[PDB]
Structure formats: C-alpha cells, structure tokens
Amino acid sequence: HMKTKDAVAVVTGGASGLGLATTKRLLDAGAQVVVVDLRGDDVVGGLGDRARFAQADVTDEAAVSNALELADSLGPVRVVVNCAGTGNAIRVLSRDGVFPLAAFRKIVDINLVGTFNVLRLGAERIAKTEPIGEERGVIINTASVAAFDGQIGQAAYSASKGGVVGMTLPIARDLASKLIRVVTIAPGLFDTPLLAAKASLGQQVPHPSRLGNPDEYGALVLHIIENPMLNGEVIRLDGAIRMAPR
C-alpha cells in the first residue's frame, strides 16, 4: 500500500457510482481521500475522518485548484482518479433537428476537458512530492467501451471518451520522467445512478451476465495503483461485451 497509506488521493465524481466505490476502496487501503464533485457532501460525511469533500466543477480551474490545496494540506498527493462525467444520447439527424452543437460541446467539456483539467493540476501536485522508491504517483482516467464500440446516439459521448483514450499514451510519455503513471479504464455496463430493463441490459453481457458492481471498478483502480508496470494503457472492464448499434 506504498502509494496509499500516508498519501492522499483525489477522486473526481467521488460521491456517486464508480467514483464512490473507488473512494471507499482507497479509504480501506489507508489513503486520505478528497472527493471532488458538484454534490455529495452528505454521502462523503458518512465515510469517516479520512475523507473530505470539495465542491468543484472539474471544468473550473480555480475550484479544482482550491480542492487541491485541501488535498495537499492533508499529505503528499499521489493518486488522482477522474470519474466525474455525464452522457447524452442524441441522433445526428432527427425530425426535431440536427444534434445541437452546444450539447456536443458540453459533453466534451465535462468528460474530456474536465479530465484533462484535473489531470494537469493533479500532476503538478504529485510532481512536487518526494519519490517513494521509483514512483511519485499515478493518475487513473475513466473512458468507456463507447470509445471503441460507440452506439447510435453516442456521437458526443464517444468523442469525449475517445479523446480520453487518445491522450493516455502521450500524457504517460510526457509525465514519465517525473515518475507519474497514467492509465485509463474503459468500463462496460455498471450499476450506477448513470443508468437512472436494467435486468435485460445485464443479460447482454457475455460473462458475468449482469451489470458491473462499482466495487469491481474500484478494485481495478487499486490494482493499477499497486502494479508499477501498468502505464500508458487502456483496460476494458466489461464482461467481454461489445456494444451493438442499438
């Protein structure tokens, strides 16, 4: 637990869904965790005195920087997990009109720009730490199988997640000399509030034929933290599903 015990993690989207499960796994591994989210202070307040909540939109650099002052005050920042995100499902062409430009921009801004914003500012905080052996820290991003298998309606969602995939390797290369790994998880179908018919959804997953449990995402995050050789890679976490057009 070298990069968690006595260290600080920042989890965006950490008050719900995949981020909440990750927060819990990190706390169980001994880290202090700053949850960065639009909302969820009550949930995070039930997680004990090693968790803190920072209200911030990941697309707002001043709010993210303020959250990172809090994180730094707790100890050396060594883990950043980008789970904040949203989706839409809109056809390119419809009788109602063309996919609105502002809707495409919004999804790209939150999912792609917001991830880069927290990554770049978080990397600055990790880079100033003393190495523990050969490592300063690790940044984990959330893409989606939609980066590869995008369905009808997913133009903006897939663009945003494809951007997260595409930037993983250059950022890993860029941060390598500072001893910061960068890895991306591409989840398949998980039982989170994002899916707020769910049973028939899970039947389409080859095996296990169910929605993913958010704790399985958190477990993979922890393995990435603990495995020094995982870097510059995207890992599908998806029960072998491949998403069909519909």
Ligand X SMILES: NC(=O)c1ccc[n+]([C@@H]2O[C@H](COP(=O)([O-])OP(=O)(O)OC[C@H]3O[C@@H](n4cnc5c(N)ncnc54)[C@H](O)[C@@H]3O)[C@@H](O)[C@H]2O)c1
Choose which of 11, 112, 212, 225 interacts with a second copy (CB under 8 A): 212
Stretch that binds ligand X, among 1-9, 25-33, 37-45, 128-136 (CB under 6 A): 37-45
d(CA 52, CA 41): 8
Sequence-ordered list of residues with C-beta below 8 angstroms from that of 14, at least 6 positions apart, any chain: 20, 22, 23, 33, 35, 36, 37, 40, 44, 81, 83
Residues in the chain: 246
Q: Is 18 annotated as a binding residue?
A: yes
Closest CA to 235 of 179, 182, 191: 182
Stretch that binds a second copy, among 87-95, 116-124, 193-201, 230-238 (CB under 8 A): 230-238
Marked catalytic residue, from 53, 104, 157, 217: 157
d(CA 57, CA 20): 16
Choose which of 8, 47, 77, 84 interacts with ligand X (CB under 6 A): 84
Q: Which does 239 bind (CB under 5 to 8 A by kind): ligand X, a second copy, none?
A: a second copy
Q: Which does 159 bind (CB under 5 to 8 A by kind): a second copy, ligand X, none?
A: none
Alpha helices (runs of H) in the chain, residue ranges in sequence order:
17-28, 41-45, 61-74, 101-108, 114-127, 146-149, 155-175, 198-203, 214-226
Q: Confirm or reject binding of residue 227 to a second copy (CB under 8 A).
A: yes
Choose which of 46, 48, 97, 193 interacts with ligand X (CB under 6 A): 193
Q: Which does 17 bind (CB under 5 to 8 A by kind): ligand X, a second copy, none?
A: ligand X
Choose which of 146, 160, 173, 244 interacts with a second copy (CB under 8 A): 173
Q: CA-CA distances (angstroms) from residue 71 to 102, 121, 243? A: 33, 12, 38
- Interface with a second copy (CB under 8 A): 134-135, 169, 172-173, 175-177, 179-182, 188, 206-210, 212-213, 216-217, 219-220, 223, 226-233, 235-242
Task: Indicate which residues carry an active-site annotation.
Answer: 157
